[PDB]
Paper text:
To provide more insight into the state of [name] within a membrane bilayer, we prepared [name]-containing nanodiscs using [name] polar lipids and initially characterized the samples using negative-stain EM, then moved to cryoEM. To support these therapeutic efforts and to elucidate the complex mechanism for how [name] performs its role in the cell, we report cryoEM structures of [name] in nanodiscs composed of polar lipids and native membranes, allowing us to conclusively identify the conformation of [name] within the bacteria membrane. And contrary to the other recent cryoEM structures of [name] in MSP1D1 nanodiscs, we did not observe an ensemble of clearly distinguishable conformations within the periplasmic domains of [name]. Although two crystal structures were solved in the outward-open state in the absence of [name], we note that both are stabilized by crystal contacts. This data matches well with the cryoEM structures presented here, where all structures of [name] within a membrane bilayer were found in the outward-open state.
In Gram-negative bacteria, the biogenesis of β-barrel outer membrane proteins is mediated by the β-barrel assembly machinery ([name]). The composition of [name] varies by species with only [name], an OMP itself, being fully conserved across all Gram-negative bacteria. Structures of [name] solved by X-ray crystallography and cryo-electron microscopy (cryoEM) show that [name]-E interact with [name] along its periplasmic POTRA domains and that the complex is overall conformationally dynamic.
Residue numbers in the entry:
A (entry chain A): 25 to 806
B (entry chain D): 27 to 243
C (entry chain B): 23 to 392
D (entry chain C): 26 to 90
E (entry chain E): 25 to 110
The structure:
C-alpha cells in the first residue's frame, strides 16, 4: 500500500492534478497490474510519455519530464507565402499552435510543412529545426525552410480531339502552357482547383459546340518533380455533333406554362448547346423568381438517341411556395442609419421574394458605396415553409476627406486651409463638403450640403455656397480684387431607375475691382459694352447671375468608388435666365466608363472623357470666371493645377492708380515699357480631356487588399481653347481658336485610399511639344 | 518585453494599470500571459488582460479573450465578472462612435451588438441574482431593451414613410410581442393605427385605437 | 517570382584526368528540338544505320559512315483539322529489320518501313505512347501512360493484349518498356506494380507490388526515373518508380523477394555486376549477394540528367550541361573528361556494334568514340 | 487611452440610470397579447447593489499561491 | 410633383383560383398548405387570419384585395369575407 507519493519537476501540471490524472492513487494495493496500468497510462495519452516508476516500499516516484511548453513562431524562409498564412494553415486546419512537441512531432510537422508546400504548387526540399530552450519549461523552434519555388512549369496536352486544335482548347484554360506574361488575364497559378476548372471548361466547350456524348475523360497530371515537370494530359473522347429537336416541360406551378413554353422554344435544326441549355434553366428559374417561387427545382435531362443523332431536352420544373420575406436585416452598418440602407432596397419586407429584386438591392447598396461587401444571404426562418429573412452583411468603412493645410508663408502668416468632403455623412445619409481657405489674403469658403433623400421617392436637395474673397493682392489694391457670392439649390429626382435629372436655381454675384492687364478681360468688357480704359486699372464690375442649373446623370457601377463593369455619364448645364446682369450658356459632360478585361476584375481599362462648351448668349461672351481649366487634378496629370489652356496677353500700363513699381512685370514700368507677350492661365470657353487608365495590381504589390489600393498607368490627352478668338487683336501672338493644344501625358498613379490618409502618387511625363506650357512630375492629392 | 521575475513584473503591471498607461499595460500583461499559461497569477493576469482590453477599447480582442476564458474555465467565483464584461463589451460596441460620443443621432444603427449584450446580461442576472453586478445589469437590460425597441420603432417609421404598410404592421407586431414595455412601443402603436386605417382594415384599426386610448392617460 | 530556388545547385565537374581522349565527336543536327520537354527519344542502331528523330515530326535516317542524311521524313498531316498539324513526338524510337517503330504523345504510333518502300502506318493507341516500343517476336508493346499497355501486330497495327495497369493520382511520366523474356513481358507501372504479362489472353501474374512510389507516399521530389525491368538467366531486376530495388526469381512463374536498395533512374546488368545511377544522381554499383553496395559516389549529385550505358569496360554517363562523365578501369578511378555541348542532355545514350551514340536536347546525334 | 480622465466612465456617453422605467401595457376587455414570446424580459427580484459607475469594475482580488 | 415612382408590392399574393379553392370547415393547417403561411395575423383577440394583396404602381390607382378568415379555439375556418379591389 503506497502511502506517500511526491512529484517533482512537473511545472505545467499541479501535483494533485497529476495524482488524480493517473489511474493509480494512495489507499489502494499497488500490484504488478497496477504498475502496468501506470505505465500504459503514461504510454496511451499521446501527448507525452516518460516512465520512471520506482516503488521501493510505500513511496511511488513517478518522474515525467515535460517537453512543454514550446512556442514555434519563427518562420524563416518565406519568399512566396506569408507566415500569417502558414499559421492559418496550421490553425484553421485543426493543427492549431498550442505546442507540446514530442520528438516525433518534430519530423512530423517538418513533413507537414513540406506537404503544405506540395499543396500550394511548389517544392521545398530542406526544413531544418533548431531547439532553443529557456529554462522554465519554455522552448522556441527555429524553422529554417528552403524554397524551391515553381508555379507555372507546365506543358499541357490533350489527346483524343479530332475536331479541334490543341491550341484552341488550351487557350481558354485557367492554366497556361508556359506562355509569356503579357498573355496574362488575371491569375494563373497552378492548383488542383485550376485543373478542375480546366477540365470543366473543356467539357463546356465541347458541350457548347455540340458534342453531347462527351462527359468521358481521364486526367493525368504527370510530374517530373524537379519542380519543372508538370505535364497535364486530359485524354478524352468526342461524340458526334448532335442536333437539338424539341423540348418538353414537366411543370408544377400555379400556371405560367405559356410563358415557360415561349421561353423554351428551339427553332428546327439547331445544334445542342451546353451553355444554351444552362441559360434555359436559369431563365426558367428567373421567370419563376420574378413571380415569387424563389426556390424552385429545375432539372434538365438530355435524352440521347443514336443513329440519327437526336437529343431530346426534358426539363421538369416544380415550384415551392409563394411569398416569403419576413424581416430584412442589415447587420454590420455600425456607423450609418439603416434608414439609409433601407431606403435603398427595392425588395420590401412583407411581400413575395424576388431574387432579381434583392440582386437590385445589393447592387444599389454597392453603387452608393460608402462600404464594401457582397451579401444577400436569404436564410429562411426555422419552423415554416415560407418566411425567408433577407440578411445583408455590409462592412462600413468611412469615406471622408480631411484635408489639412499648415503654412507655409514667410511675409504671410501661417495659412489655414481645411477641406472636409464627407459623403453619406457618418451620422446620416447626408453629404457635406467644406473647402474653407484663409490664406493670409485669400478667403475662399465652399459649403455643400445635399440630402440624397428629401422625400421617399429619391429627390435630392443639394445646396452649395461659395464666398470667394479672391484678392491675391500685394499691398491693398490694383491686384484683381474679386468677390463671389455663390448660392445654388439643386432639386434632383431619379427617373429612369438609373438616371437622375437635376434642376436648380443659382445666384452668382461677381464683383471685380482694379482689373489686371489681360486683353481677354477687356474683350469681355467690350462685349458687355462697358467701355473700359486700356492703361489704367480703376475698373469696377458688379454683376449678378440668376442661372437655371440643369443636370443629367446615368450611373451603372458594379461597385462604389472603385468601379468595375461600369459607365457613368454626368451632364451639367448652366443657362442664365433673362433678368441678370450677365448672360452665358455653359455645358459640361463627363463620362467615366470602366470596362474590365479580366473576368476576376483585377485588371480594368478606365476611359474618362469630358467636354465643355461655354459661349455667351447673343451679344455677349461667356464671362472669364467660368472658363474651364485643366491639369493638376484628376483631369490631366503632368501639369500644375489649372494651367492647360490659352494664355492671356497683357496690355501696357505705366499708371494704374499708383501701378506698384518693382512689381507686376510683363509690360509695367520696371520691366519692359512696351508690348509684352504674356503667359498666364486664364482658361478658355472650350475643354476636351480624354484619358485612358490601366488599373493593374502588379505582382510587385502585396494583394491582401483589393479595396484600398488601385494602381493606374494612364495616357491622357487634354485641350483647352477659346472659341471666340481672333487674329485682329492677337496677330503677333499665338492664336487660340483651334483644338491643337493636345497635351499627351503618361503616368503612374498609386491610389491608396485607406480612409484617412492617401499617398496618391501621380508621376506623369508630359510629352506633346507645345509652347507656353507649365509642367510638374509629382502630384500627391488628398 | 523584459524578463523580470513574476512578482516584479506583475507589480509594475498593476501600478501602470492604476496609472492609466493602458497600451503599455496590455503589453506587459500579455507578456506575463505568454510566459506562463499556469499559476494563480496566470488566472489573475487573464482577468487583468480582459480588463485592459475593455479599457483600451480593443473590443474585438476583448470579446475573443473573454469567450476564451469562459470556455477554458467555466466554474469560478468570478464568472459573474466574466459574463458582466462580455455584456459590457457588446454594449460598448453598440455605443462606440463619433455620434455615440456626440450623444446625437443614434439608437437605430446596427443593433446586433445590443441584442448580444442583452442576451448576455439576461444570462448574468438569471444565473446569479445575488451578486454585486446584478442591479447594474438590470439597468443595462432596461436601457438595452429600450434601445432595441427604439431600433424597431425606427424601422417601422421608415416603412410607414415609404408605404410598406404590412412591413409596418409586422414590425410593430414584433415590438408588441417581444417587449410591450418601453416607451417606444407606446409611441409605436399609432403606427399600427394608421397602417390598418390605410389598408382599410377597419375593425382591426378600431381595436388598436381602443388599446392606445386605454393605455394613454 | 518563379525563380528563387535556394535548392542545392549542381556540383562542379571533378578533375579532368582521363586515359582515353575522345578522338572523335562526329555530329549531326536538324536544329531541333527536344527543348526541355522531358521525353524519351534516342537513336537506335540497326546494321550501322542510325534512325534518329526529334520532337517536331522529323525522322532523319542516318548511317555511321560520317553520317550523311538518308530518308528524311516529316511526320505531320496537312488535311483534316489543321494545316501541317503541329504534332509532338515524345516518342520511343526502335528498329526491327527495316521497321522503325516510333511512338508519339499525340496518341499515335507510326511505323515507318524502310524495307519495301515506305509503309508508314499509324495505329491510334489509347492514351499517349511514351515508352520505347518493344519488338517481341510478332508484337510491338506500347506502355502508354494512361496505365494502358497496348500490343500491336506488325505491318498493319492490331490492338490486342490490352492490359490495364493501375495509375495513381500523379500518373507519372513513368515510361516502362516491357522487356520480353520466355513469352512474358515484364512491365513496370506508374504506382509500383511490376506486372508480368504472360500472354495467354493478356494474363498478368501478380497479386503484389512495391508499396512505395510517388503519388501515395510522396518523397523528396527527386524520384524522376525511366523505369525498365531487366531479365537475366531467370531473374527480373526491377527498380520501380520510386527507389525500392526488387529481385524476382522466376521459378516456373513469378517468385518475389525485395532486397530494398532505393534511388532508381535506370540500370544495366552484366552477368553478376550491376551498374545503375540514383535519384540522388550517384553511380552505385551492385553485386548480386543480397545487394551489398559498391561504388558509393558523390561528385555528381543533382545533375538534372545522368543516365548510364556501358561498352568495353568503360561506363559512359550522359548528364546535363553537355558533358559525358566516363567511368572505366573500375575503382579507384572515377574522374571524367568530356564536354561536347553547351546544349545539354536529357536522353539515353545508346551503345551498339562498338559505336556509342548520344542524342542531345538540341542537335541530333553526337557519336563519341574512344 | 486617457488624459487624466475615464476612470469611472464607459466609452462614449452613458445613459444607464436615465432609462425610461418599464411599464406594462394595460389590456382592454379581452384584447390580451403575449406579454413575451422571446428572451427580452427582466427579473424583478433583484437589487440592491452599487448601481452606476461607482462599483469596482476592476478585477476583484483573490489569494495568490 | 415627381413624374414617376417605384412600384410597391405588399404581401399575400393570390389568384382567382387561389381565393376560390377554400371553403368553410377546412382546418388551418390545410388552409396554410393551400394559400401559404399568412404573414399578417391579428395577435389580440380571435384566431383570425388576414390575407392582403396590395400593389401600387407608378402613381395610378390601387390594388387591394383582402381575404379575411376566422378560425376558432380548435381552429376551423368559418365566416370568410373577401373584399376585392379596395
Amino acid at each position: 500500500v503506497v502511502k506517500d507519493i511526491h512529484f517533482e519537476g512537473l511545472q505545467r501540471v499541479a501535483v494533485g492534478a497529476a495524482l488524480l490524472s493517473m489511474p493509480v492513487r494512495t489507499g489502494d494495493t499497488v500490484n504488478d497490474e497496477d504498475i502496468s496500468n501506470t505505465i500504459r497510462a503514461l504510454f496511451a495519452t499521446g501527448n507525452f510519455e516518460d516512465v520512471r516508476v520506482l516503488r521501493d516500499g510505500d513511496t511511488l516516484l513517478v518522474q515525467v519530464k515535460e517537453r512543454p511548453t514550446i512556442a514555434s513562431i519563427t518562420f524563416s524562409g518565406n519568399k512566396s507565402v506569408k507566415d500569417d498564412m502558414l499559421k492559418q494553415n496550421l490553425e484553421a486546419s485543426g493543427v492549431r499552435v498550442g505546442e507540446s512537441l514530442d520528438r516525433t512531432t518534430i519530423a512530423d510537422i517538418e513533413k507537414g510543412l513540406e506537404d503544405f508546400y506540395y499543396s500550394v504548387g511548389k517544392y521545398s526540399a530542406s526544413v531544418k529545426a533548431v531547439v532553443t530552450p529557456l529554462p522554465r519549461n519554455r522552448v522556441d523552434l527555429k524553422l529554417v525552410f528552403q524554397e524551391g519555388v515553381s508555379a507555372e512549369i507546365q506543358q499541357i496536352n490533350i489527346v483524343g480531339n479530332h475536331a479541334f486544335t490543341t491550341d484552341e482548347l488550351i487557350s481558354h484554360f485557367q492554366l497556361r502552357d508556359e506562355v509569356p506574361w503579357w498573355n496574362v488575364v488575371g491569375d494563373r497559378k497552378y492548383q488542383k482547383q485550376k485543373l478542375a476548372g480546366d477540365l470543366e471548361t473543356l467539357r463546356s466547350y465541347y458541350l457548347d459546340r455540340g458534342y453531347a456524348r462527351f462527359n468521358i475523360d481521364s486526367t493525368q497530371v504527370s510530374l517530373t518533380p524537379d519542380k519543372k515537370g508538370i505535364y497535364v494530359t486530359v485524354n478524352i473522347t468526342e461524340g458526334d455533333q448532335y442536333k437539338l429537336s424539341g423540348v418538353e416541360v414537366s411543370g408544377n406551378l400555379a400556371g405560367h406554362s405559356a410563358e415557360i413554353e415561349q421561353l423554351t422554344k428551339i427553332e428546327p435544326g439547331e445544334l445542342y448547346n451546353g451553355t444554351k441549355v444552362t441559360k434555359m434553366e436559369d431563365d426558367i428559374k428567373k421567370l419563376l423568381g420574378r413571380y415569387g417561387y424563389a426556390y424552385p427545382r429545375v432539372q434538365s435531362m438530355p435524352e440521347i438517341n443514336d443513329a440519327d443523332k437526336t437529343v431530346k431536352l426534358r426539363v421538369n420544373v416544380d415550384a415551392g411556395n409563394r411569398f416569403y420575406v419576413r424581416k430584412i436585416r442589415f447587420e454590420g452598418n455600425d456607423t450609418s442609419k439603416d434608414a439609409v440602407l433601407r431606403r435603398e432596397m427595392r425588395q420590401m419586407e412583407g411581400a413575395w421574394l424576388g431574387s432579381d429584386l434583392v440582386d437590385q438591392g445589393k447592387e444599389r447598396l454597392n453603387r452608393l458605396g460608402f462600404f464594401e461587401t457582397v451579401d444577400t444571404d436569404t436564410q429562411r426562418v426555422p419552423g415554416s415553409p415560407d418566411q425567408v429573412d433577407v440578411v445583408y452583411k455590409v462592412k462600413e468603412r468611412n469615406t471622408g476627406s480631411f484635408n489639412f493645410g499648415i503654412g507655409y508663408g514667410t511675409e504671410s502668416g501661417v495659412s489655414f486651409q481645411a477641406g472636409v468632403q464627407q459623403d453619406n455623412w457618418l451620422g446620416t445619409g447626408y453629404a457635406v463638403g467644406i473647402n474653407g481657405t484663409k490664406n493670409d489674403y485669400q478667403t475662399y469658403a465652399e459649403l455643400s450640403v445635399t440630402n440624397p433623400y428629401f422625400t421617399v421617392d429619391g429627390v435630392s436637395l443639394g445646396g452649395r455656397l461659395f464666398y470667394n474673397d479672391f484678392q491675391a493682392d500685394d499691398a491693398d489694391l490694383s491686384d484683381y480684387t474679386n468677390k463671389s457670392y455663390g448660392t445654388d439649390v439643386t432639386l434632383g429626382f431619379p427617373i429612369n431607375e438609373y438616371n437622375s435629372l437635376r434642376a436648380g436655381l443659382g445666384y452668382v454675384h461677381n464683383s471685380l475691382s482694379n482689373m489686371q492687364p489681360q486683353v481677354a478681360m477687356w474683350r469681355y468688357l467690350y462685349s458687355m459694352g462697358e467701355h473700359p480704359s486700356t492703361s489704367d486699372q480703376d475698373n469696377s464690375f458688379k454683376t449678378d447671375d440668376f442661372t437655371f442649373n440643369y443636370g443629367w446623370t446615368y450611373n451603372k457601377l458594379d461597385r462604389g468608388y472603385f468601379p468595375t463593369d461600369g459607365s457613368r455619364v454626368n451632364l451639367t448645364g448652366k443657362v442664365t435666365i433673362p433678368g441678370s446682369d450677365n448672360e452665358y450658356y455653359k455645358v459640361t459632360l463627363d463620362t467615366a466608363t470602366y470596362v474590365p478585361i479580366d473576368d476576376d476584375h483585377k485588371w480594368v481599362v478606365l476611359g474618362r472623357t469630358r467636354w465643355g462648351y461655354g459661349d455667351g448668349l447673343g451679344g455677349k461672351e461667356m464671362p472669364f470666371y467660368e472658363n474651364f481649366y485643366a491639369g493638376g487634378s484628376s483631369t490631366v496629370r503632368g501639369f500644375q493645377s489649372n494651367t492647360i489652356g490659352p494664355k492671356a496677353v497683357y496690355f501696357p500700363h505705366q499708371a494704374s492708380n499708383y501701378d506698384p513699381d518693382y512689381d507686376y512685370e510683363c509690360a509695367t514700368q520696371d520691366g519692359a515699357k512696351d508690348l509684352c507677350k504674356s503667359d498666364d492661365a486664364v482658361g478658355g470657353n472650350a475643354m476636351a480631356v480624354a484619358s485612358l487608365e490601366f488599373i493593374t495590381p502588379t505582382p510587385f504589390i502585396s494583394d491582401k487588399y483589393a479595396n484600398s489600393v488601385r494602381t493606374s498607368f494612364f495616357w491622357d490627352m487634354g485641350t483647352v481653347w477659346d472659341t471666340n478668338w481672333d487674329s485682329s487683336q492677337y496677330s503677333g501672338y499665338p492664336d487660340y481658336s483651334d483644338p491643337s493644344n493636345i497635351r499627351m501625358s503618361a503616368g503612374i498613379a498609386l491610389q491608396w485610399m485607406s480612409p484617412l490618409g492617401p499617398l496618391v502618387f501621380s508621376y506623369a511625363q508630359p510629352f506633346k511639344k507645345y509652347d507656353g506650357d507649365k509642367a510638374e512630375q509629382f502630384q500627391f492629392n488628398i | 518585453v523584459p524578463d523580470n521575475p513574476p512578482n516584479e513584473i506583475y507589480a509594475t503591471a498593476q501600478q501602470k494599470l492604476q496609472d492609466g498607461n493602458w497600451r503599455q499595460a496590455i503589453t506587459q500583461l500579455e507578456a506575463l500571459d505568454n510566459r506562463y499559461p499556469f499559476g494563480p497569477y496566470s488566472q489573475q493576469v487573464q482577468l487583468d488582460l480582459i480588463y485592459a482590453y475593455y479599457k483600451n477599447a480593443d473590443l474585438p480582442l476583448a470579446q475573443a479573450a473573454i469567450d476564451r476564458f469562459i470556455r477554458l474555465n467555466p466554474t469560478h467565483p468570478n464568472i459573474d465578472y466574466v459574463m458582466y464584461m462580455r455584456g459590457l463589451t457588446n454594449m460598448a460596441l453598440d455605443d462606440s462612435a463619433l455620434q455615440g460620443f456626440f450623444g446625437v443621432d443614434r439608437s437605430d444603427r446596427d443593433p446586433q451588438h445590443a441584442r448580444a449584450a442583452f442576451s448576455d446580461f439576461s444570462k448574468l442576472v438569471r444565473g446569479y441574482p445575488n451578486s454585486q453586478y446584478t442591479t447594474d445589469a438590470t439597468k443595462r437590460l432596461v436601457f438595452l431593451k429600450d434601445r432595441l425597441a427604439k431600433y424597431e420603432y425606427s424601422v417601422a417609421e421608415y416603412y410607414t414613410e415609404r408605404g410598406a404598410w404590412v412591413a409596418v404592421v409586422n414590425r410593430v407586431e414584433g415590438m408588441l410581442r417581444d417587449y410591450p414595455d418601453t416607451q417606444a412601443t407606446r409611441d409605436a402603436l399609432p403606427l399600427m393605427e394608421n397602417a390598418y386605417r390605410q389598408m382599410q382594415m377597419n375593425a382591426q384599426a378600431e381595436k388598436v385605437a381602443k388599446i392606445i386610448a386605454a393605455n394613454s392617460s | 517570382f518563379n525563380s528563387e530556388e535556394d535548392v542545392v545547385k549542381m556540383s562542379p565537374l571533378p578533375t579532368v584526368e582521363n586515359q582515353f581522349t575522345p578522338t572523335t565527336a562526329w555530329s549531326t543536327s536538324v536544329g531541333s528540338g527536344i527543348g526541355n520537354f522531358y521525353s524519351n527519344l534516342h537513336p537506335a542502331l540497326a546494321d550501322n544505320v542510325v534512325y534518329a528523330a526529334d520532337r517536331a515530326g522529323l525522322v532523319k535516317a542516318l548511317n555511321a559512315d560520317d553520317g550523311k542524311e538518308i530518308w528524311s521524313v516529316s511526320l505531320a498531316e496537312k488535311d483534316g483539322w489543321f494545316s501541317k498539324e503541329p504534332a509532338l513526338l515524345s516518342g520511343g524510337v526502335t528498329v526491327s529489320g527495316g521497321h522503325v517503330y516510333i511512338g508519339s504523345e499525340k496518341a499515335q504510333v507510326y511505323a515507318l518501313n524502310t524495307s519495301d518502300g515506305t509503309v508508314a502506318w499509324q495505329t491510334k493507341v489509347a492514351g499517349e505512347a511514351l515508352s520505347r516500343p518493344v519488338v517481341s517476336d510478332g508484337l510491338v508493346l506500347i506502355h502508354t501512360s494512361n496505365g494502358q499497355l497496348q500490343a500491336l501486330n506488325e505491318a498493319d497495327g492490331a490492338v490486342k493484349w490490352t492490359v490495364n495497369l493501375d495509375m495513381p493520382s500523379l500518373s507519372l511520366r513513368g515510361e516502362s518498356a516491357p522487356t520480353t523474356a520466355f513469352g512474358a513481358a515484364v512491365v513496370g507501372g506508374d504506382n509500383g506494380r511490376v506486372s508480368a504479362v504472360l500472354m495467354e489472353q493478356g494474363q498478368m501474374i501478380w497479386q503484389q507490388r512495391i508499396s512505395q512510389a510517388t503519388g501515395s507516399t510522396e518523397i523528396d521530389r527527386l524520384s524522376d526515373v525511366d523505369t525498365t525491368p531487366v531479365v537475366v538467366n531467370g531473374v527480373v531486376f526491377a527498380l520501380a518508380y520510386n527507389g525500392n530495388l526488387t529481385a524476382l526469381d522466376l521459378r516456373s512463374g513469378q517468385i518475389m523477394w525485395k532486397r530494398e536498395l532505393g534511388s532508381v533512374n535506370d540500370f544495366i546488368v552484366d552477368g553478376n555486376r550491376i551498374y545503375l545511377v540514383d535519384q540522388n544522381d550517384r553511380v552505385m554499383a551492385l553485386t548480386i549477394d543480397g545487394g551489398v553496395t559498391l561504388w558509393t559516389q558523390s561528385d555528381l549529385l543533382h545533375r538534372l540528367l545522368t543516365s548510364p550505358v556501358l561498352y568495353n569496360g568503360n561506363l559512359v554517363v550522359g548528364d546535363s550541361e553537355g558533358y559525358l562523365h566516363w567511368i572505366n578501369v573500375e575503382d579507384g578511378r572515377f574522374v571524367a573528361q568530356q564536354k561536347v555541348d553547351s546544349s545539354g542532355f536529357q536522353t539515353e545514350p545508346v551503345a551498339a556494334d562498338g559505336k556509342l551514340l548520344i542524342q542531345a536536347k538540341d542537335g541530333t546525334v553526337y557519336s563519341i568514340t574512344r | 487611452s486617457s488624459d487624466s480622465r475615464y476612470k469611472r466612465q464607459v466609452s462614449g456617453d452613458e445613459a444607464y440610470l436615465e432609462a425610461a422605467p418599464l411599464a406594462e401595457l394595460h389590456a382592454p376587455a379581452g384584447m390580451i397579447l403575449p406579454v413575451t414570446s422571446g428572451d427580452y424580459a427582466i427579473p424583478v427580484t433583484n437589487g440592491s447593489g452599487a448601481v452606476g459607475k461607482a462599483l469596482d469594475i476592476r478585477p476583484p482580488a483573490q489569494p495568490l499561491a | 410633383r415627381v413624374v414617376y415612382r417605384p412600384d410597391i408590392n405588399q404581401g399575400n399574393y393570390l389568384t382567382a383560383n387561389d381565393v376560390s379553392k377554400i371553403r368553410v370547415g377546412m382546418t388551418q393547417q390545410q388552409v396554410a398548405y393551400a394559400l401559404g403561411t399568412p404573414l399578417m395575423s391579428d395577435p389580440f383577440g380571435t384566431n383570425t387570419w388576414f390575407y392582403v394583396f396590395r400593389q401600387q404602381p407608378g402613381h395610378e390607382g390601387v390594388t387591394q384585395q383582402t381575404l379575411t378568415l376566422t378560425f376558432n379555439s380548435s381552429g376551423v375556418l368559418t365566416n370568410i369575407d373577401n373584399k376585392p379591389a379596395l
